[PDB]
Amino acid sequence: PGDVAIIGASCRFPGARNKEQYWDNLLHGREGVTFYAKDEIEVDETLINSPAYVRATGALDGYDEFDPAVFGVSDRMAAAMTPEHRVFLEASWEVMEDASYDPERVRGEVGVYASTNPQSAALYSSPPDWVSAGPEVMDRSNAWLPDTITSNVLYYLGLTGEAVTVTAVCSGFHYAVHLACQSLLLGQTDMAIAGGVMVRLPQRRGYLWEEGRILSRDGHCRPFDANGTGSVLASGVAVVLLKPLPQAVADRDHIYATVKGTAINNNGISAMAYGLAQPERLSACIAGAMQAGDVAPETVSMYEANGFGMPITDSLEVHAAHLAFGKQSGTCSIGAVKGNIGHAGVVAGGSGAVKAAFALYHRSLPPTINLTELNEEIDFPRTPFVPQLEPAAWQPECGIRRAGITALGGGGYNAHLVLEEPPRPVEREPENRRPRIVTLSALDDAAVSRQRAALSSWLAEHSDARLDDIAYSLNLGRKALPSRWAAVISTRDELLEVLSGDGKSGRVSRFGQERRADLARFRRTEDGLALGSGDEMRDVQALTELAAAWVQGERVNFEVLHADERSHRISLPNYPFARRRFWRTDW
Amino acid sequence: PGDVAIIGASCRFPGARNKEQYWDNLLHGREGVTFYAKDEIEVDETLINSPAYVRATGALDGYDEFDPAVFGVSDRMAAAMTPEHRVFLEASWEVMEDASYDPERVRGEVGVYASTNPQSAALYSSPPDWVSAGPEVMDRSNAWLPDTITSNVLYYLGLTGEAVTVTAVCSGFHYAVHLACQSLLLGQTDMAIAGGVMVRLPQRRGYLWEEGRILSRDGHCRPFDANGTGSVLASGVAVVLLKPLPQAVADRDHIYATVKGTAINNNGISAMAYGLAQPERLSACIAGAMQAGDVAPETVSMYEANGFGMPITDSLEVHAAHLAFGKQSGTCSIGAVKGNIGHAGVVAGGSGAVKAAFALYHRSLPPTINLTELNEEIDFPRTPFVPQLEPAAWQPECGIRRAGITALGGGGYNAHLVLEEPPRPVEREPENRRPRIVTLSALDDAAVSRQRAALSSWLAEHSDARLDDIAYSLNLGRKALPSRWAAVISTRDELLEVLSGDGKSGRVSRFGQERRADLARFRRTEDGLALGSGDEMRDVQALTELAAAWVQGERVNFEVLHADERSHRISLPNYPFARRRFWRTDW
Numbered sequence A, B: 001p002g003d004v005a006i007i008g009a010s011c012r013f014p015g016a017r018n019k020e021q022y023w024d025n026l027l028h029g030r031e032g033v034t035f036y037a038k039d040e041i042e043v044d045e046t047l048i049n050s051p052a053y054v055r056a057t058g059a060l061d062g063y064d065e066f067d068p069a070v071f072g073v074s075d076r077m078a079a080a081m082t083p084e085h086r087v088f089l090e091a092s093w094e095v096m097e098d099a100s101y102d103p104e105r106v107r108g109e110v111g112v113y114a115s116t117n118p119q120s121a122a123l124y125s126s127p128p129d130w131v132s133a134g135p136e137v138m139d140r141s142n143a144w145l146p147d148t149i150t151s152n153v154l155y156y157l158g159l160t161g162e163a164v165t166v167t168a169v170c171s172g173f174h175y176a177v178h179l180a181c182q183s184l185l186l187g188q189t190d191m192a193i194a195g196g197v198m199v200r201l202p203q204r205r206g207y208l209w210e211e212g213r214i215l216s217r218d219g220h221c222r223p224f225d226a227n228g229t230g231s232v233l234a235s236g237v238a239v240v241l242l243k244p245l246p247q248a249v250a251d252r253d254h255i256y257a258t259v260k261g262t263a264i265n266n267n268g269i270s271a272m273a274y275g276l277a278q279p280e281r282l283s284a285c286i287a288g289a290m291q292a293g294d295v296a297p298e299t300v301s302m303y304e305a306n307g308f309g310m311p312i313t314d315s316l317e318v319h320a321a322h323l324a325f326g327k328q329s330g331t332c333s334i335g336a337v338k339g340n341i342g343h344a345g346v347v348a349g350g351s352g353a354v355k356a357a358f359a360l361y362h363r364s365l366p367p368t369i370n371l372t373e374l375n376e377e378i379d380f381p382r383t384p385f386v387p388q389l390e391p392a393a394w395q396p397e398c399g400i401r402r403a404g405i406t407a408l409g410g411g412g413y414n415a416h417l418v419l420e421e422p423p424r425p426v427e428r429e430p431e432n433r434r435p436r437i438v439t440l441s442a443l444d445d446a447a448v449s450r451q452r453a454a455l456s457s458w459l460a461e462h463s464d465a466r467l468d469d470i471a472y473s474l475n476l477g478r479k480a481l482p483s484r485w486a487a488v489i490s491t492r493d494e495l496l497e498v499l500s501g502d503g504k505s506g507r508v509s510r511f512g513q514e515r516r517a518d519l520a521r522f523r524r525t526e527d528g529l530a531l532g533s534g535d536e537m538r539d540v541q542a543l544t545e546l547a548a549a550w551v552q553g554e555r556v557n558f559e560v561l562h563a564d565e566r567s568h569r570i571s572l573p574n575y576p577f578a579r580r581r582f583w584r585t586d587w
């Protein structure tokens, strides 16, 4: 094998609070940069009136919001945690939900590899003082140190494995995915959480334009444009769940795309100015990634570029990509997502990787925006690359869909990873009509009601989703939380009816109001309560009593319920986090 | 009836390390602003390449230099003290020396009134933490708090009295002089140290030009000029020693000028933009100061203005002064010293007051520089004021020389003080030719040699200085320090010869090496050793043994040595401070 599957994803970007909102924005060519009036910016009093100050930024909505009760975190600790700690932790929870894996029931080793910006931690609060070694000191250290961005995931999700934090400037996301795959291919872990986080402080802030530098003169990012003047600074987060491809296919996971190869290197002594791609070192990086995945440049029909929007930086990157593709490669779609959202720093490579992964999944090519006058110096007809001006269906003459994503940063950091479309979906056996248990749990009743509203809305969106996959994913892919709700249904239409309204019109809901469940009916197993016979697991009354016992707070062995069928994990709505704002008051 | 004499002065400004250098620069119309290359500024990385950044400032040479051993300060404490603490402490030492008063032997109550910029301390180091009450905590507080800028002077100079620190933005010097004079007129103190200190941090730094604001566009300050765009930021220190006029004449002090009146008020609800003078409030301040000293505007022939260099602010200030002078005032010379050095913040009013005092003392009017096109909007021929374009002798038709100095600041702070030339000198009796004792002491032997070189150089410049004044000032105006030197001479030429070379060619020096002084020859007084008879005080051998006893470290009553003659205190060189560099290393 040596291929790594992306079985779950979670991200937040300017103008997008989730991946579905992110993909919909890329499809319609929307811009997520925010423009402010002078009074809306409450910092930079010395610069706000300068003619060179641009009141534009890529804002991250809810950078200060967190739901500590879901993770078991105290309010004091939530304020002590840097925004990058909270945002990445909340995204790791969501990436596990998107893959339908309950961390409490994960039997293998999970690695957490993430990249973070230490400049953000240094601006949020003063660092820990290690003059004493009390427990409150350890709490303050775990809230501030970049080293514990990955450790806190292992602790607060209940996972066991290894945690590694890397700091790689603007290539952070790729370096995390690169290192995560080494862990998987060497067999040290079974699946891996990999990603990056960037929260710029102060958040609501502009920047200062200087002639010839990477920052834009008008606040617009125009990649590959002749009139491009640079990019905008942005914040975001992107996390993916990684798993070896043969194991992901065997376990009937939900696969967005596969990672064929990754490669990293540094410009070293052959250094450039910031944003300038050195042709020899970057091309060696791109070629090494394709060599690692055994993909030929003829087969890559999408190239997601770094693309600041500077004529000189775009020319050096397209030339470096040209050296790696060769002459005989053919034609390839080129684009830069920074035109949509700006430069997201640590996670800038993640926005491009997430764009490429979803492009392979939906077999669609999103456009590159703010492109009106093509850069004549890049001479695109003499290169394999064609700027994606319009959205288009992805139907390559090659026969296979493969994409390459590049991340450039300061300090000479280079990185490139090559993705392939997921395996073709297998032929499914016809769905058996039988009563099934569906479950929803959160911390309080209001959050469960939001889960019911989100699921009924989701059912309208995805009319081709099978009912046996929904129940398998909800029952085996979500953590059992205190406030619980369940129903016993046989069709998709019955599911929509029980979810509607207050949710109490269902068979299980009326059972819980009348009497408590009789536990002598069930057999206790190592994983919880189970039904006494195989014939019992197809009786509506037996399934109804078991679900009510679960709603009452008992632990149920959901594995033995789905042992007879080979269902698939699917992507369902995430937890509806109640987002209170947390910010430190003492420096 | 309430006149206060300026009997000592000390200052440092851009381009001047002492008051003699400052007056000489004003006389020749020199500019003390410094211009830097981009690489010479090691701060403001984000602004250094902006087209609006002006690499100009009024630097204070040696802002980080200090000689803590002379004050009894430890090296640890010298690094803990803010630069404003050290600069003001060193200037207070110099101002007592300039007036020829030894703080150990001052019999009265001395008040120390100063103004400081608390923003500098907040940038130099983190503030003290009061979680405990140990002596090391108190040392850190005394090193950081602005309240102890004045207290440390009382403690380290050996004075007893009262200390008051005020913070009055750009009117700081005037408010200190105002409060000092109230202390004297109410009899709370016998003499007062008054001044201010301004050390801008970071020191070597430019500024950002913004159109229509107070900062200059080219780095030059052009007061009353039609093409003026503002001023430059400057650092400095200015301290004066104040004493009631009748007492200063009775003690034969050296009087630069006298303070006739002072007045303060605030713009209040009648507020303006920064630097803009409200005519009604500022004129009331100017008129109130002249009313306090019982001086009529017809008698004021010099007006030292605030003078930023902006056409609108210069026009409003000249209008306010016109309202206070009336129509029948006559003619008056107007100038603004900010053209020479820039805006010195807390001590900005000090630069003008010191310029006016030396103008009154030397009977000269220094020019206003950078003035090529007069502001037609002010209409100077229709006002009593005439811009002093060239240096000129001060011979007013009024008959008396009086000056008014105005200080404007942010927050609406206004201040104005009126000075008069010193009293006419009395007729001196011819100098008796007799042997006299002259003394020099410092902290180490190398500093004493610098004192001898400084004293011999001074003798060439001031050939009209009487020897009985020189000995009286050296013997009664300097602190007795461990490394000592003395000589017994009768003429100025004998003084020049013994000071020359290694300084060991005198009878006192040859006496100390051969034999020790026999103290039984002398009589003990409450203030030290004295000679047994009046006839002995004219014997060379008796005076030589007494001087040698002092060099060996004994305490000598110098009051009784000069009791028979009425000598005068004169201005002699200051201590040659060995200036080691001190800066904090931990925030």
Ligand SMILES: [K+]
Pocket (backbone or CB within 6 Å): B263, B264, B265, B288
């Ligand atoms: K008043």
Ligand SMILES: [K+]
Pocket (backbone or CB within 6 Å): B519, B520, B521, B522, B523, B524
């Ligand atoms: K005796």
